[PDB]
């Protein structure tokens, strides 16, 4: 038996943004963890006093990996506050803009952020140096396939951004989503261009990405047995499928303590005892949220607030959405689960709670979700009407409020805006990596990733690779978490 070693990792790399992780290891396992989001900008105060329409540009600069998610949440909040009635064709165009970035983001995450956890890259920076015992288990052939696919994926993710820009203007930071809809009507010619790129992405997802995740996973079966944490998840709904506001590609729900529950957003509160914000702002629902930095506050260790749902610490992201919604698994996944794992599965929950809520389960969920998004995008390409108007032009209200709910690639996202005297009076953001990468709440309950680190194996304190491997499975984006 061994005693304690305390390990600090700052920066955690191959994530987005500024994260320190500190873990306590005892006898070869993590027994405690603290996550610190280390960079603050304060978008919620920067936004005050502006024309509300500016928000759908300003907020994207929270995160250049997921700006379409912030764009979407912002325009939905503005739509509600302004009483803007988005035309049907604009709803579909928005889904095509944003859906293309799901493809970009998941591919970026698996290959360009995560795959080096399992694959040795070429012998030059930024692929070396690395831990001397990095636990890289793949055969020469499979490792080379990983490298070849990493390189091909650089082109595929770029093509995904061309898809975003076709109707979104450019990417990062789209111009094409505004209050009232989408700024550019899809033409027949540009829909051909979107479909041609989409075919290439589909082929890569179906033939390379989904198979490689299961194949690498089959060499790391131990990684399905760790990282469970609270086994608790949130989905707030995303990608509206009609104009009612009641039907979405991902439907909302909460899952905790083995039970499905409805999602009621009034049960969200943000705690700050362990966050660098003024103590008197603790425990606020986002409609009354406040952002008062306190970088010298004793005992705090993060610029991420601690969101809790009816007191629960929940995770978000592809696993959360796929668990809550329980879609059928991809044909590839069903086959490889049988061939490589001896698992007979039809729907996502057939993986079982333990394997789904695991380090490798989160990578599998993200690959399955990417495949699932292909079908949604294909459907929108059949549903869109070339030439039909996509925007209305609503007057700015003097006094109003609105909330936009969506699912960023990393998990649940909401923006709340209150308008007074035709200007932003308050703007509050509750983002995906906020739900995942937050610190303890005022009762000392850990954030989702902090809790999922408990039990992670560290058999070699000099090469503690599984700490950041677990973190990377959640695809963190600390710039989103802090804003």
């Amino acid at each position: 038996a061994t005693g304690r070693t305390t390990i600090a990792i700052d920066p955690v790399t191959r994530i987005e943004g500024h994260l320190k992780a500190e873990v306590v290891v005892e006898n070869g396992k993590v027994v405690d963890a603290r996550l610190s989001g280390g960079m603050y900008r304060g978008f919620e105060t920067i936004l005050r006093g502006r024309d509300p329409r500016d928000a759908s540009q300003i907020v994207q600069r929270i995160c250049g990996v997921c700006p379409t998610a912030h764009s979407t949440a912002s325009v939905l909040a503005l739509d509600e506050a302004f009483g803007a009635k988005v035309p049907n064709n604009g709803r579909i165009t928005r889904n095509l803009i944003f859906g293309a970035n799901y493809l970009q983001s998941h591919i970026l995450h698996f290959y360009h952020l995560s795959a080096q956890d399992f694959v040795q890259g070429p012998d030059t920076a930024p692929f070396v140096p690395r831990f001397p015992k990095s636990d890289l288990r793949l055969s020469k052939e499979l490792n080379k396939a990983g490298v070849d696919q990493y390189i091909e994926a650089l082109e595929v993710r770029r093509i995904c951004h061309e898809m975003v820009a076709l109707f979104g203007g450019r990417m990062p930071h789209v111009q094409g989503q505004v209050v009232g809809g989408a700024t550019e009507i899809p033409t027949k010619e540009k829909l051909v261009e979107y479909a041609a790129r989409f075919k290439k992405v589909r082929d890569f997802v179906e033939q390379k990405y989904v198979p490689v995740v299961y194949t690498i996973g089959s060499k790391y079966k131990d990684m399905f047995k760790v990282g469970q944490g609270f086994k608790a998840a949130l989905c707030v709904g995303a990608f509206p499928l009609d104009n009612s506001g009641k039907k979405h590609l991902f439907m909302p729900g909460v899952y905790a303590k083995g039970k499905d529950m409805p999602f009621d957003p009034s049960k969200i509160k943000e705690y700050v005892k362990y966050s660098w914000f003024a103590e008197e702002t603790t425990g606020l629902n986002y409609k009354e949220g406040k952002t008062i930095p306190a970088p010298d506050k004793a005992g705090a260790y993060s610029f991420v607030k601690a969101p809790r749902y009816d007191g629960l610490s929940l995770e978000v992201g592809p696993l959360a959405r796929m668990w809550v919604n329980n879609p059928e698994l991809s044909p590839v996944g069903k086959k490889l689960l049988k061939d490589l794992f001896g698992i007979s599965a039809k729907k996502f929950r057939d993986l079982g709670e333990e394997a789904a809520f695991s380090l490798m389960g989160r990578h599998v969920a993200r690959a399955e979700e990417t495949y699932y998004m292909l079908g949604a995008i294909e459907g929108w390409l059949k549903e869109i009407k070339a030439g039909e108007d996509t925007v209305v032009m609503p007057a700015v209200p003097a006094s109003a409020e609105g909330t936009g709910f969506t699912e960023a690639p990393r998990g649940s996202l909401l923006h709340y805006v209150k308008v007074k005297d035709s200007k932003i009076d308050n703007y509050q953001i509750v983002s995906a990596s906020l739900w995942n990468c937050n610190p303890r709440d005022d009762m000392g309950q850990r954030g989702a990733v902090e809790e999922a680190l408990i039990g992670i194996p560290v058999d070699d304190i000099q090469n503690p690779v599984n700490v950041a491997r677990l973190i990377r499975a959640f695809d963190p984006x600390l710039s989103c978490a802090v804003h």
Binding site: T13, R41, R50, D54, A125, M171, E184, V391, X477
Partner: protein, 283 residues
């Protein structure tokens, strides 16, 4: 380039950035990002993409920095916040000591061959420095000057920049250095910067004076809805008249669109972005 060619070391530090300046670079078409990384530069430290992590990654950068003192290129993405003794941006920890962005730029800044301030945040302060902020977000050139650090700075702004502006400025510089050595080469680069530190090949021309809708502007034919692509976008908020960038020609994301065709220009390359370009959706 070749896999066996000369490739200078680059460290990429993120301050108050959004990672969009890294992402835009990943979208480079020619050369592709794979070719940039394997044939043009040696990206020795970059938190988003590098293999190693934590104190080991920091120490690797420090070892390279010592070996290449005066010769590495330092890319900064994001502004540098000076309030609260630098605490609003911590970029790492080594020797049980946290390293703020302030600390990092004071450490590596003096020893770089040049600092490339990539994006409007790094170049000019940008959104983190805008009204309502409270972190003391500071542009790279101002921070270095305030601290007596004389290393040359080149600004490559945009929110985000186009990948071609980033790669193209690197290529400009490396060509000048091949022809003239480091100091002579950087002097040739400085000669082609405008008064805002921007390379004139990319930022020397005005959007509006080169815009395909200029005839409509001059005729007073203005679109009243974003989806009317015939009229000029001025009344919808286009800031093309006050913006120096080549987007009208280069366009974005493989040439598939650009901001003025799709919606409006928001002036994202300009030193007063965002506040001097706001409100975005009226003139």
């Amino acid at each position: 380039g070749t896999l066996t060619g000369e490739r200078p070391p680059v460290f990429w530090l993120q301050g108050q950035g959004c990672t969009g300046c890294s992402v835009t670079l990943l979208n480079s078409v020619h050369p592709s990002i794979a070719d940039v990384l394997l044939k043009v530069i040696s990206l020795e430290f970059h938190p988003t993409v590098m293999a190693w992590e934590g104190e080991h990654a920091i120490e690797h950068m420090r070892k390279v920095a010592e070996k290449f003192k005066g010769k590495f290129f330092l890319v900064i993405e994001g502004s540098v916040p000076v309030e609260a003794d630098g605490k609003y941006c911590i970029i790492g920890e080594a020797n049980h000591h946290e390293i703020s962005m302030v600390d990092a730029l004071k450490e590596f800044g003096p020893n770089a061959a040049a600092v490339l301030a990539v994006g409007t945040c790094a170049a000019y302060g940008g959104i983190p420095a805008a009204e309502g902020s409270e972190t003391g977000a500071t542009a790279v050139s101002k921070f270095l000057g305030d601290n007596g650090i004389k290393t040359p700075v080149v600004n490559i702004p945009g929110c985000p920049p186009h990948p071609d502006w980033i790669v193209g400025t690197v290529v400009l510089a490396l060509d000048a250095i091949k022809k003239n050595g480091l100091e002579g080469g950087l002097a040739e680069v400085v000669k082609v910067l405008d008064s805002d530190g921007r390379p004139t090949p990319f930022f020397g021309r005005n959007i509006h004076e080169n815009c395909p809708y200029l005839d409509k502007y001059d005729e007073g034919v203005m679109s009243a809805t974003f989806t009317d692509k015939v009229g000029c976008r001025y009344d919808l908020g286009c800031k093309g008249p006050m913006t120096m960038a080549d987007c009208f020609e280069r366009k974005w994301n493989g040439g598939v669109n650009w901001c003025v065709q799709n919606a409006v220009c928001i002036g994202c390359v300009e030193p007063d972005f965002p506040d001097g370009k706001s409100p975005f959706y009226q003139a």
